[PDB]
Design a binder for this molecule. Sequence first.
Ligand SMILES: CCC1=C(C)C2=CC3=N/C(=C\c4[nH]c(/C=C5\NC(=O)C(C)=C5CC)c(C)c4CCC(=O)O)C(CCC(=O)O)=C3CCN2C1=O
Ligand SMILES: CCC1=C(C)C2=CC3=N/C(=C\c4[nH]c(/C=C5\NC(=O)C(C)=C5CC)c(C)c4CCC(=O)O)C(CCC(=O)O)=C3CCN2C1=O
Lengths: 472, 466
Amino acid sequence: DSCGAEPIHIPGAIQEHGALLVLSAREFSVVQASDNLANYIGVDLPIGAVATEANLPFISVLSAWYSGEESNFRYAWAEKKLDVSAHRSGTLVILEVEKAGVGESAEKLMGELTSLAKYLNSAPSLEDALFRTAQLVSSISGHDRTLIYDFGLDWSGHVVAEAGSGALPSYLGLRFPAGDIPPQARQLYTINRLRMIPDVDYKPVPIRPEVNAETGAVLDMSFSQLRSVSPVHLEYMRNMGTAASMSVSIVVNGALWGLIACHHATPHSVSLAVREACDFAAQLLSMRIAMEQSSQDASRRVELGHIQARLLKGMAAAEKWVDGLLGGEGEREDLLKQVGADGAALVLGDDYELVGNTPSREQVEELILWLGEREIADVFATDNLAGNYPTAAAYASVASGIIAMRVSELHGSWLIWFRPEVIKTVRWGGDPHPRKSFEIWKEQLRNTSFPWSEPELAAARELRGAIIGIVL
Amino acid sequence: CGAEPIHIPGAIQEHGALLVLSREFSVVQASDNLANYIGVDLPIGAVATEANVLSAWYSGEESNFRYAWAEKKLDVSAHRSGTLVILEVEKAGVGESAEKLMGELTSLAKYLNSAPSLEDALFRTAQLVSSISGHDRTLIYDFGLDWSGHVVAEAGSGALPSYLGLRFPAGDIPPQARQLYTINRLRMIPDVDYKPVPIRPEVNAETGAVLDMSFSQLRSVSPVHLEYMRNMGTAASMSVSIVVNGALWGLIACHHATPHSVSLAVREACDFAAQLLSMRIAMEQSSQDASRRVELGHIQARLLKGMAAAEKWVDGLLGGEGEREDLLKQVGADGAALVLGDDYELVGNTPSREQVEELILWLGEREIADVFATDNLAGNYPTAAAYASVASGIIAMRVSELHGSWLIWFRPEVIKTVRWGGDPHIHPRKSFEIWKEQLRNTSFPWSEPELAAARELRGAIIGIVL
Ligand SMILES: CCC1=C(C)C2=CC3=N/C(=C\c4[nH]c(/C=C5\NC(=O)C(C)=C5CC)c(C)c4CCC(=O)O)C(CCC(=O)O)=C3CCN2C1=O
Ligand SMILES: CCC1=C(C)C2=CC3=N/C(=C\c4[nH]c(/C=C5\NC(=O)C(C)=C5CC)c(C)c4CCC(=O)O)C(CCC(=O)O)=C3CCN2C1=O
């Protein structure tokens, strides 16, 4: 992968819309600065120069912030009509200024986020919540489009919500490949959960010197708001037909879950106040995504537990243990519901017992012959068995998904769950330098079952213990 | 005590005015002081005109209303009360910035979401509310089952005493108060010695009944509580209900040595804080409870595996060292007794056979459709104070349809010093000086994943007996 290579956190440049000034913590002496710094601060505060009241009036407050626990800094510099925002970078203090947006009212913004927060807290459907948020951010940002983007496992992403003036195309329901947000980007966005690109064709403003005197290494601009972005992405943006962007990371249990991602046909900047409202929205949404994702997963483990109980009760109470699973109509229905499967095969040497919708004995024999040649210390699972075992495309209709599970130490006894092919049309807007066309690219997904939930596998892992234990 | 209806006192505090409109927008009821604030005659019967947004709010879904009346320097805040519109005005707190408040709640929300210890979260919140309210003390108060409360966090100028760690009796916030505060999650008393401002008429024309002031911010409070406040040495208060999944979990409770009022804007920032904290309390309370069901599941698995594999089913529980250890860990118990008629099997730390026999004789007289449980068996069965040291907590459980077979879990007395700040054992009490006691005959409380693990195992046993 050439994509993942580029180090995006140390480009030694900023965008034009602000200025960057590096101080050494000791005596607050200017080590590095953007070339444009002179234009904004409006002073000769150059390399080597030590910061005093007459340079930075907020120096006392900055000093007192550095000594304190607080991680970031904000000061509204009335006299120059600027907003100052500083983070710490080891022994360094990175300090970013940009022109203080007029016209915003915080009493409106507060009223609007009081509403979202109160609504999200009134447990609504995950989809309803997703949109409401996308809608609020579209309102206060004023972006042509405000889509929400939920990552899957493969780190491809599905546009799950959208909100737009209709100036830019509808991407709602389209999936994009993982390569569009590469691993380093993902990593950064998990710790720095907001980036704004107000003009795509901005000319990078260099930071001099390139190498910091005090550290003797490139300035890590991971948490720099003004950080100049990957030229390759500025191209991706052009291809798409966006002149402006602003993403906001949705993070649930320290995992990048998705992005709130605004776009604009023409260049478009957004106030500090409004960016700080969108971060708050992204947090509130992230708290909901977790509570939904949680209480949903919670109810599932309970529902699968009640089953595992009935299967273990039956396996203990009955004369032959096997009849706890296959004994009656209810038992054989539990065995299947225990992982939400359509079919099950309980092999015990040369003693096959098929339940529900399975492939034939001869097909399962040949399946077990191939599971024998894998490394399965836990349980084998897949929602595309065809992709692993090409010969099992012949019975895709009935088994595209299996949870295979050996139920001894000595091989030749198994419990496999089967799950049928679910065809679904996938609309990419793209395909498998960046790509020029995002025209809705279709495909039917074959030989692929409904995906195995983690409470389902965990219910299976358990039952295996129980069976393996009764066999001994 | 629970009797007195605190939602229909037909009076307001002095710090605002209340005006009831019927939609012809006609004045039905008003506080006596209304004239002083609005500065207009707008009397009983009178229909509202410009000289005398709200219209568009009434037609809309939105439940509450806010308009900052710049010209008179007032905040207007209206709720709906059936066919009525209750409308409350008070003097707009000056100087305040919403850009600050937003910045402060952006921080808290981002911090709470950065999964910190429940205690850390509790304090940070109490600290933020202490900052924007400017109250002498800003304690957080977590209800138990008995509806007594434990002060779990605090933040103060040090003007008023530290109640951190002290428990208060349920009688301090009586059932009707609790009920109201679960639906109206905010109340402010800016001056304890306020003179109640009457609402006239006492009987509303449109409804023909006393004005339900459940959601009235200005509602005059129980004289008995104004006394409790005096006894405590507080002139001012402001509570904010912490509600988690529709259940009143606790209160953010600010106090002041001298009278002290707080803007609508700042009260609405503290409600937001209480919500953000409530979302954390749920996520912690959830992912904790989640890990517990998994840990107890892995056990229930081993117990059911053993009970199926072994020759006699009973040996799945008491067979070996590991099995006997699982049986106990299945509810985090120190002891277990598996009775099967006249066939006792004691595990870990239990009371004697003769003591359990006599225990089972009393559980027979109780009626247990689920499982019997308690962390104060002494309080239910006085004679089992004799073996409190070993069984202050039991999960008793009948393990057949045919009587005479049981599975009881034992849990030992945990002595703990309880600091009350008041004798909790009607007029209110004058002294809130740290009142100590050793709490006896009481085990560590039974978690809900523990009982649920027990409920399960019973099914399994009762099923193998058939
Ligand atoms: C339709 C849904 C959607 C997608 C798929 C999407 C993509 C997206 N890519 C972004 C970032 C990057 N893409 C790339 C690189 C690539 N993207 C590609 O598609 C390809 C081929 C590359 C080459 C490695 C890089 C390095 C970055 C990090 C830029 C930086 O901060 O320095 C970013 C972050 C840019 C932003 O919005 O500020 C996005 C967000 C915007 N966005 C969307 O709304
Ligand atoms: C140390 C922790 C703590 C406690 C224990 C506490 C008590 C408290 N009592 C409150 C309310 C009431 N108590 C009572 C009644 C009693 N309080 C008592 O102590 C006693 C004996 C009674 C009657 C039996 C009533 C009716 C009310 C409802 C007042 C209203 O909503 O108008 C209220 C809510 C009233 C408020 O504070 O604004 C509180 C909150 C303040 N507060 C605390 O911070």
